[PDB]
Amino acid sequence: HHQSNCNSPSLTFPRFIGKCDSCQLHTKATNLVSCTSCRKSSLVYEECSTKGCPANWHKSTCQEPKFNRGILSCYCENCQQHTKEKQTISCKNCKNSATTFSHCSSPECHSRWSF
């Protein structure tokens, strides 16, 4: 609590591949939001690329993942700024969606990000 907030949010959206806990293959993609200024991060969404894995959010009948990504802009309930984003992940072919976690980029909120 001796710490101080970051007053220059500068956001990037890293993606790392790792081991999926379900199928145990090296196919789990962890997508984040990160501030390069303070180097804190918040999980946005996870997905496994293994066909048929419960951690893969596509229908069983999906022929081809057609990835598209959406952005919604909201007012934040913690800092009252217009700095909140709800991202959407869905497939144009199969119509399923991945679970997503929102984030707020304000100095007040993004400084409390953890990962």
State whether residue 71 is helix, strand or coil.
strand
| Min dist. Cβ of residue 110 to Zn ion (A) | 6
Nearest to 13 by CA among 74, 85, 92: 85
| Min dist. Cβ of residue 8 to Zn ion (A) | 6
98 touching Zn ion, by CB under 5 A: no
State the DSSP code for 69: E
Q: Is 76 annotated as a binding residue?
A: yes
Nearest to 32 by CA among 84, 100, 83: 100
Residue from 48, 57, 87, 98 binding Zn ion (CB under 5 A)? 48
The smaller minimum CB distance to Zn ion, of residues 23 and 44, is found at: 23
Structural contact between residues 92 and 68, judged by C-beta atoms closer than 8 angstroms: yes
∠87-92-97 over CA atoms, to 5°?
45
Residue from 45, 89, 106, 113 binding Zn ion (CB under 5 A)? 106
Note the residues at the interface with Zn ion (CB under 5 A).
6, 20, 22-23, 35, 37-38, 48, 50, 53, 55, 58, 62, 65, 76, 78-79, 91, 94, 104, 106, 109
